[PDB]
């Protein structure tokens, strides 16, 4: 649309500057990749200074405090080379670095060399000191909030038993909390959504970059790792309803888990002098830690998915997905 | 107050973490330095990780968008070692690094070695790419806004001629705009308030750090330099009403101006191959540039001061100060 093009043009000229000042409106069109759009400097123009030639316009399409935290977080991760560079912030959105790349696919997560690189990157992320609350209320605080939001949803006319009741989730949350309370896991700065779609394979390699910090917070290490392992099971590119596919046998084997964990710990502990024996203990303990915190991935996203279903119709089977996550929760809990 | 102490304690524990978790309430008291407070970790406690032992709590005591920009800016300057580190952001304020230091005094600005260091630091600041509007509307946009705000002030009962009328400021703004429009000055990321009080002399030296980014924006280089030169004249520590003192003969001489400019340009142009002749031209041009943009410092702060006067009584002579700035404006304009 004319208006959308004009706004993008203005934002690029104003926030990027440099060569962008020389761009004529007729030479720039936005490309959707929807709230996300690519903008590229015309080939004929040389860059002036360090201003980027390739950006993504992200439109917000959220509380004040929330927006402050989100923007500060993005800005800091950019400075630390853990996210895309930040070129403009304005009321409607932001301008970010377009990272030349493609996202990983579900099946690629299991490849040993990529898996090692993901583990290293996650550990790097977990090394960050960020100016946010360090108290680990995010996990159960968010789940408790989601549960309350679900309880408060207006009835829709759908006749099925409420998933909260079918799976006894209010009670089960207490059961999960008790299990996890018995399971030490250090509190670190977590991504919280390290799925394939958020892992960019760089065309100009440090071979990967994480994106999508919507859910990031100080949280239990075990959640970030366990959540990533859960993602090995789900492909969100499936072309028929419900528009995801679960392959439970694709959950990582013990050997695949340990491979990841060894590389994670190599990065996390790189500044430390540890014996082979101490290292093995750290690995074994982390295996157990993750086996329990992985359950929280199912619980968390199942609750989140019920809420998504309340805002959805036929574009994705959110309720179906929720039920998949809760089924796997009880299966894997039973397998501990 | 009990409540203030409790909040500070909670914020420190929650946002700083580490050793702060071990602090008992009875061991921590805030020290005013008022919206700014020092918090120090008890001596007996060892640090756990990289969490700071010495912080400043800054209470806000402002629009959403404004707060986003302010916080992003602070966070970025911290990452780039151009401002204090940022340890917490929350609705009420922030936690910052306490920089072991003291502020400069007015008279110290003229010392050649310090002046050279200030010039270098200002040029460093001007090297920053920041995710904010690059269009230079800040100067006249802000002054136009201030003028409109002054026009809209409720009458108070004070009988004196309005300074806008006494100094024909609406007309004069157009005169200034025309002069500056004829005066090239590159648009860079400016501090906009490089007064002595905002220049910290480090106790653990890079010998200085700037603080107070309230006014920072993309703006004309000439304003930042000229404003700094104006500050050589004013001491805001004067102990009798109006609680500032002006010493007009303390404005930098041509030689003092050129000393500063040489050091500024040495930093600004460090990546460039310039002949002695080209360098001298850059210096001479900058001298003229600054001589004109310095006038905008008087105008800007005079307008700002009228607004401050509307919220003040006996704590500082804002209207008196405004009149000082406007008098010097017309004097220095006449001397061009
Ligand atoms: C577990 N997970 C990490 C939760 C957080 O998701 P995000 O990372 O915020 O996406 C992923 C997840 O639950 C998820 C991921 C993707 C999708 C999704 C994928 C595709 C579509 C779709 O493009 C499918 N469609 C093309 C057939 C119609 C338009 O909508 C809609 C939704 C739905 C759910
Ligand atoms: C030109 N300037 C850079 C404008 C921006 O000021 P800020 O950097 O935001 O302070 C500085 C300026 O105009 C200014 C700077 C300081 C003061 C000021 C200094 C001291 C006080 C004072 O502490 C004086 N008092 C102790 C006698 C009573 C309480 O208020 C009040 C105001 C007033 C004005
Ligand atoms: N900075 C970037 N450069 C290139 N591609 C990106 C960038 N950020 C996100 N993407 C891609 O765009 C898609 C959505 O971006 P993301 O930040 O994950 O938003 P969301 O998942 O909430 O829509 C992802 O597939 C991701 O691979
Ligand atoms: N991070 C810091 N560490 C130590 N002192 C500081 C720090 N920030 C500000 N100060 C000092 O506190 C005073 C006020 O801080 P500043 O940021 O300039 O706020 P404002 O001038 O708006 O009150 C200044 O005198 C400055 O020297
Ligand atoms: Mg994403
Ligand atoms: Mg200050």
UniProtKB/Swiss-Prot annotation, chains A, B:
Changing residue 325 to L: In MDCMC; decreased choline kinase activity. GO terms for biological process: CDP-choline pathway; muscle organ development; phosphatidylethanolamine biosynthetic process. InterPro entries: Kinase-like_dom_sf. Keywords: Acetylation, ATP-binding, Congenital muscular dystrophy, Disease variant, Kinase, Lipid biosynthesis, Lipid metabolism, Nucleotide-binding, Phospholipid biosynthesis, Phospholipid metabolism, Transferase. Its EC number is 2.7.1.32, 2.7.1.82. It catalyses: choline + ATP = phosphocholine + ADP + H(+); ethanolamine + ATP = phosphoethanolamine + ADP + H(+). ATP binds at residues 58, 97-103, 195, 212. The keyword GTP-binding does not apply. GO terms for cellular component: cytoplasm; cytosol. Pathway: Phospholipid metabolism; phosphatidylethanolamine biosynthesis; phosphatidylethanolamine from ethanolamine: step 1/3. GO terms for molecular function: ATP binding; choline kinase activity; ethanolamine kinase activity. Belongs to the choline/ethanolamine kinase family. This protein is produced by a bicistronic gene which also produces the CPT1B protein from a non-overlapping reading frame. It is linked to Muscular dystrophy, congenital, megaconial type: An autosomal recessive, congenital muscular dystrophy characterized by early-onset muscle wasting, intellectual disability, and dilated cardiomyopathy in half of affected individuals. Some patients may die from cardiomyopathy in the first or second decade of life. Muscle biopsy shows peculiar enlarged mitochondria that are prevalent toward the periphery of the fibers but are sparse in the center. Homodimer, and heterodimer with CHKA. Has a key role in phospholipid metabolism, and catalyzes the first step of phosphatidylethanolamine and phosphatidylcholine biosynthesis. This is Choline/ethanolamine kinase. It comes from Homo sapiens.
């Amino acid at each position: 649309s004319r208006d959308a093009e004009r706004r993008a043009y203005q934002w690029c000229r104003e926030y990027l500057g440099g060569a962008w000042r020389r761009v004529q409106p007729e030479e720039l069109r936005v490309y959707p990749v929807n709230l996300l759009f690519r903008c590229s400097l015309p080939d004929h123009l040389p860059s002036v200074g360090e201003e980027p030639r390739e950006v993504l316009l992200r439109l917000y399409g959220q509380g004040v405090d929330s927006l402050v935290l989100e923007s500060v977080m993005f800005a800091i991760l950019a400075e630390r080379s853990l996210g895309p560079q930040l070129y403009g912030v304005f009321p409607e959105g932001r301008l970010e670095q377009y990272i030349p790349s493609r996202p990983l696919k579900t099946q690629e997560l299991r490849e040993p060399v990529l898996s090692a690189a993901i583990a290293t990157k996650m550990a790097q992320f977990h090394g960050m000191e960020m100016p946010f609350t360090k108290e680990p209320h995010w996990l159960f605080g968010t789940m408790e909030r989601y549960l309350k939001q679900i309880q408060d949803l207006p009835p829709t006319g759908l006749p099925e038993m409420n998933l909260l009741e079918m799976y006894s989730l209010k009670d089960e949350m207490g059961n999960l909390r008790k299990l996890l309370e018995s399971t030490p896991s250090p509190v670190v700065f977590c991504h919280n959504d390290i799925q394939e779609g958020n892992i960019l394979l760089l065309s100009e390699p440090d071979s990967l970059m994480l994106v999508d910090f919507e859910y990031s917070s100080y949280n239990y290490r075990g959640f970030d790792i366990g959540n990533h392992f859960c993602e090995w099971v789900y492909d969100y590119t499936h072309e028929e309803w419900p528009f995801y596919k679960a392959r439970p046998t694709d959950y990582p084997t013990q050997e695949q888990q340990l491979h990841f964990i060894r590389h994670y710990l190599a990065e996390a502990k790189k500044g430390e002098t540890l014996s082979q024996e101490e290292q093995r203990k750290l690995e074994e303990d982390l295996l157990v830690e993750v086996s329990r915190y992985a359950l929280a991935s199912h619980f968390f996203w199942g609750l989140w998915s019920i809420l998504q279903a309340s805002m959805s119709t036929i574009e994705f089977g959110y309720l179906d997905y929720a039920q998949s996550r809760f089924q796997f929760y009880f299966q894997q809990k039973g397998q501990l």
